[PDB]
Design a protein around this ligand. Structure first.
Ligand SMILES: [Mg+2]
Lengths: 111, 113, 452, 162, 56, 50
């Protein structure tokens, strides 16, 4: 069943924040899937990233930052996140955690 | 054989032209390096331990036109350090053996008076 | 027809006690005998020097490929070999301005010039050690070329000497070495070309840094237990001589312990390179007490070796202070008589490890030769062998040869295949060069980490 | 049974990396099959029956090597029958190989990074191996010692002619 | 050689890994070309919900 | 043996010299990079030396 909390983030810098965030949620018992901490090596990552967003994810957490919204590979996880949100009739699905100091609710994507 | 004094030993080398085509036993013993002429040289110290032998040591001496020796020890040392790169194990062995064979008086030895 | 006996290569222990014959291969394959958690750098240089040092550290993070990878093994990367971390971002940098160096260099007194050049760096090092809470394991001194060439009562010797009372491991790295590409002799090519030997440079620098930071890259095991391999070196002071001793022995756990055994032993004599009975008795008592405290019981043999021959009086003193049940062997190792062996047909020198036995009391040993392991001979020209003479005592001339060859394999200052002369003698030489470069120390440190 | 980790790479250049990694994996108890460590029929045989993982030492030349792509092509085939998505593991080693020239049979996959330091990559590789429950023997330095010498510590041999 | 990458998208063309490989390379090539108007999908399957496609 | 010295000045100084000398020597002879030296002092040291 979908009982996993997906996390999207920029690949190079967001790791620090997400790593702390991922471990705390795991320590609280929240099942978490991070694209660097739970992705097996040699897998077809989009095949398993897309599949789990559709099927494994019950919440979608976006580490929002000045580059995490300009990153092509993250918006793709957002774009599928909106679609799975529609079928799941859950408006409280995408939770855009804002971390960057300079990002203030005025350059965020309309999604 | 023309003598070149060392610090604490005695070196011996061939003046250019003394050998036939400045070489012996098909091994060149006097040659040319750029503007200077290199001369293969030896120094002998006879020892009775372990058993009576004549320890011979290889050297390289340098002259301007093959006639007179360069009077700068630093220049001579620098010229040799560069000339040493070219020569190899076989190159040193052949030169040493050919230079010794020149000393031969009879077929298989040579005598000291 | 003269017969040459052969002494086989000894094996040096690596991680988990695994054995190999090459440090450059044993480390890259197995790992160091003892692993450290990591190395906190410390740099005393300019902004240019700090940039160079950080560039070089990050460069040796990545694997280093030298031109002739087959003959000289490549460098996997620092953490890939030793297992610890050495980051270029953890630098406790202490800036040295070119202007203060300039005002030092303009002083008329050359001795005061070199003293002040040493004092600048050492006082900055001391200040950081006592003030910066940031723990620094090894202090890396990136010196510019002006220091090396203008200052020539030596910079390196005094600098290592004046830090001995504070016990601070240090590593001098001339910026010509780390930035060899951008140091050219106006021809457009580097002053000394490391291109084909970059990997071996990384090996040497990384091994030196790892050793000075508390790690043991490799240890020896192919030596006889119960024997204290002891080496003396005499250094000239101008009319005094200065004896320095280095000792290597196997412990209760069968672990080789290599440590210096130095005490002041100054002799002013017409007959040079000899010790008075008091100095010799002190020497030997110090070494025997060190072995006793390390292992409890006394050694079964005191294998004293040196580059000089012992006279009667000092040997009688040695025997007088020696307890019962312990034999003394005094061995003289000389490298002056030219016995150059040319191979009949070929182009590569005699193999390393060949030994010519003169008689029951002497031998020739080719500690330098052509090593098939690297396919690279240790000598460009014909290698002169070392003359090993059993000066005093009773010993087996082949056992002494294998013991000396084993002692030639513990040079931690360079990660070469093996040393031409036994390591105890070379490190005692370094100690003598350093311990005689400053004022007498009440108790010098007995760890080479502070000297090499 | 399949309990071997195939290592493919360029014959004349990638030797150094594969030799270190294969010896590293052997020292850890794995069973490694490398052409340098150890004919086309034989190579295919292992990938078809003996291999359990296919580690691709990927570089700017290992993807232009015709013989390597054939090993990839059979590896793609074997991966399907085993129903294991995690069969081919692209060890990227070359500095200038940046995820835009990768061959199409490996682009869809996530590499194991060796570009910045080999030690973290081996740390990454071991993590993937345990994550995928690849069985491994005890790292005994006995039979493993044999391979070590057969590779380097037997080369130490001294020809015994006069 | 390719200047455009037209994807005949259907309920089976998106489950064909062989096809996904061809997009995976296209996308990269798209980055080499910075041609955002490169992959131009072609949905012929009315059964496909148009909103059940890969993130790419 | 240090404990039985009559003078308190000699008692505390010798105990201090006991511990620090081993630390100082082990920081000059040992090739181990010790980080923090932990002196697990026996309880007799605390109150007999007072
Ligand atoms: Mg050094």
């Amino acid at each position: 069943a979908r009982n996993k909390i997906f996390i999207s983030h920029a690949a190079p810098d967001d790791n620090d924040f997400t790593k702390w965030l991922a471990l705390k949620l795991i320590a609280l018992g929240y099942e978490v899937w991070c694209d660097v901490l739970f992705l097996d090596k040699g897998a077809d990552f989009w095949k398993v990233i897309d599949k789990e967003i559709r099927e494994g994810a019950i919440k979608f957490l976006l580490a929002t930052s000045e580059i995490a919204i300009k990153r092509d590979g993250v918006l793709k996880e957002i774009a599928v996140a909106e679609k799975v949100k529609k079928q799941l009739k859950d408006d409280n699905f995408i939770i855009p955690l804002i971390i960057d100091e300079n990002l203030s609710y005025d350059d965020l994507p309309p999604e | 054989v023309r003598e070149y004094p060392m610090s604490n030993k005695m070196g011996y080398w061939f003046e250019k032209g003394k050998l036939e085509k400045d070489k012996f036993n098909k091994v060149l013993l006097v040659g040319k390096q750029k503007d200077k002429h290199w001369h293969f040289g030896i120094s002998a110290a006879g020892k009775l331990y372990p058993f009576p032998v004549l320890m011979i040591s290889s050297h390289i001496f340098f002259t301007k036109d093959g006639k007179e020796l360069i009077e700068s020890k630093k220049i001579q040392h620098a010229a040799r350090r560069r000339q040493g790169k070219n020569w190899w194990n076989d190159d040193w062995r052949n030169k040493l053996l050919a230079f010794v064979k020149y000393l031969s008086d009879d077929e298989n030895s040579f005598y000291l008076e | 027809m003269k017969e040459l006996i052969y002494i086989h290569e000894p094996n040096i222990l690596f991680a988990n006690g695994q054995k190999c014959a090459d440090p450059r291969d044993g480390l890259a394959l197995f790992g160091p005998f003892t692993k450290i958690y990591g190395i906190k750098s410390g740099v005393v240089g300019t902004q240019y020097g700090l940039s160079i040092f950080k560039n070089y550290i990050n460069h040796i993070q990545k694997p280093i490929y030298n031109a002739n990878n087959i003959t000289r093994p490549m460098f996997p990367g620092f953490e890939a070999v030793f297992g610890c971390k050495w980051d270029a971002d953890n630098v406790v940098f202490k800036e040295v301005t070119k202007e203060e160096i300039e005002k030092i260099l303009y002083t008329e007194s050359n001795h005061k010039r070199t003293y002040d050049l040493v004092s600048l760096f050492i006082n900055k090092i001391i200040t950081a050690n006592k003030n910066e809470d940031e723990k620094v394991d090894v202090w890396f001194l990136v010196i510019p070329d002006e220091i090396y060439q203008y200052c020539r009562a030596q910079f390196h010797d005094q600098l290592k000497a004046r830090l001995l009372e504070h016990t601070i491991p240090t590593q001098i790295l001339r910026e010509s070495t780390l930035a060899w590409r951008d140091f050219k002799n106006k021809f457009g090519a580097p002053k000394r070309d490391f291109s084909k030997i970059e990997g071996h440079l990384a090996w040497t620098i990384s091994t030196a840094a790892f050793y000075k930071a508390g790690g043991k890259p490799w240890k020896l095991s192919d030596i006889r237990s119960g024997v204290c391999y002891l080496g003396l070196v005499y250094k000239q002071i101008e009319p005094k001589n200065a004896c320095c001793a280095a000792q290597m022995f196997l412990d209760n756990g069968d672990g080789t312990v290599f440590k210096g055994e130095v005490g002041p032993w100054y002799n002013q004599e017409k007959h040079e390179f000899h010790l008075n009975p008091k100095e010799a008795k002190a020497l030997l008592t110090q070494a025997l007490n060190s072995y006793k405290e390390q292992n409890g019981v006394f050694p079964k043999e005191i294998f004293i070796h040196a580059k000089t021959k012992f006279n009667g009086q000092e040997w009688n003193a040695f025997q007088e202070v020696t307890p019962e049940g312990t034999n003394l062997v005094g061995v003289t190792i000389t490298k002056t008589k030219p016995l150059k062996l040319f191979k009949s047909e070929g182009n590569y020198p005699i193999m390393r490890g060949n030994a010519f036995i003169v008689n029951e009391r002497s031998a020739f040993l080719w500690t330098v030769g052509y090593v098939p392991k690297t396919e690279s001979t240790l000598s460009m020209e014909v290698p002169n062998p070392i003359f090993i003479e059993i000066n005093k005592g009773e010993a087996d001339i082949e056992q002494v040869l294998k013991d000396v060859l084993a002692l030639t394999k513990l040079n931690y200052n360079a990660c070469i295949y093996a040393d031409g002369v036994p390591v105890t003698l070379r490190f005692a030489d370094k100690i003598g060069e350093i311990l005689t470069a400053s004022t007498e120390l009440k108790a010098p440190p007995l760890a080479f980490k502070y000297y090499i | 049974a399949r309990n071997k980790i195939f290592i493919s790479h360029a014959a004349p250049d990638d030797n150094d990396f594969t030799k270190w990694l294969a010896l590293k994996l052997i020292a850890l108890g794995y069973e490694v099959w490398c052409d340098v460590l150890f004919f086309w029929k034989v190579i295919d045989k292992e990938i078809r029956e003996g291999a359990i993982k296919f580690l691709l030492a990927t570089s700017e030349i290992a993807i232009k090597r015709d013989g390597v792509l054939k090993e990839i092509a059979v590896a793609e085939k074997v991966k399907k029958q085993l129903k294991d998505d995690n069969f081919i593991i692209p060890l990227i080693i070359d500095e200038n190989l940046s995820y835009d020239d990768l061959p199409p049979e490996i682009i869809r996959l996530n590499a194991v990074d060796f570009k910045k330091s080999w030690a973290v990559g081996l740390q990454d590789l071991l993590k993937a191996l345990d994550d995928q429950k690849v069985e491994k023997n005890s790292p005994d330095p006995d039979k493993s010692n044999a391979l070590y010498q057969q590779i380097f510590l037997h080369n130490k041999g001294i020809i015994e002619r006069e």
